[model samples]
Target: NLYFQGTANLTTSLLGDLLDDVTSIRHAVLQNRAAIDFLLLAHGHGCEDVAGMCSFNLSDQSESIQKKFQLMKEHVNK
Candidate 1:
């Protein structure tokens, strides 16, 4: 919550990573609702990169990354 200082006014590229970090911690954004709106309202297209992050993978971690994320999602949703 204390992370941003209106850096979106500085760069759109930074805004993309900002959304990435926010969505990566989506538990609160989703459950907290307020944060969800904050992200949703940050820009019209922030969620585009959010989806990008969800589908992103490292050099070789794509194998277990998907599996672990599946398990993690299930656990978190439960």
Candidate 2:
């Protein structure tokens, strides 16, 4: 798998921490074949945005954006 980190203007330590967290999650995902298969299935069906939507706390999003994201998630889950 290709592994890399991309962030917009993050400081060194901040970027490192984010990269580490992603790496840990990747390790867990790689270790679990079923989890990887689910992610692959979602991506194949154009639901890649699901992970992005769930990654952050909705409180960080504007109310309108949060509502839209929630609706999109509902559609994807259906």
Candidate 3:
């Protein structure tokens, strides 16, 4: 899918052809808990744009992000 500034450029034909594929990929990713957590953490840390990259339907994952931050802190502290 071609995205201009993160919005899918959906011509009618492209939408018809690619919608199923996109839905399948989304479902596959959602089934993987780790992938969702990673995305949450990445968005929390400013690694990804929350508006465009994250699912707002997911719960806030600030605690997990904090734990990861602490782990990195330990590594840098040593």
lDDT of 3 by residue, 1-78 (tens): 234423432333354356456656656766664566676786675425444444434544456655755565454433
Q: Which stretches of candidate 3 lie over 4 Å from their true place?
A: 1-10, 34-78
lDDT of 2 by residue, 4-73 (tens): 2222223334544665676577666555644655676767843344454233222332455446545654
Give the candidates in order of lDDT, highest first.
3, 1, 2
Pairs in clash, predicted candidate 3: none
Whole-model lDDT for model 2 versus the true structure?
Answer: 0.48
Best by TM-score: 2
* TM-score to native of every candidate shown: 0.26, 0.30, 0.29
For candidate 3, what is the TM-score? 0.29
Clash count, one per candidate: 0, 0, 0
**Against the unseen true structure, what C-alpha lDDT does each candidate score?**
0.48, 0.48, 0.51
Evaluate model 2: give its TM-score: 0.30
Q: How many clashing pairs does model 1 include?
A: 0
**lDDT per residue (tens digit) for residues 42-78 in model 1:** 7764544554333323234445655765565454434
Instruction: Quote the positional error of residue 65 for candidate 1 in Å.
Output: 0.6
Query: What are the C-alpha RMSDs, in order, of all predicted structures?
Result: 17.8, 18.0, 21.2
**Candidate 1 Cα errors over 4 Å, as ranges:** 1-58
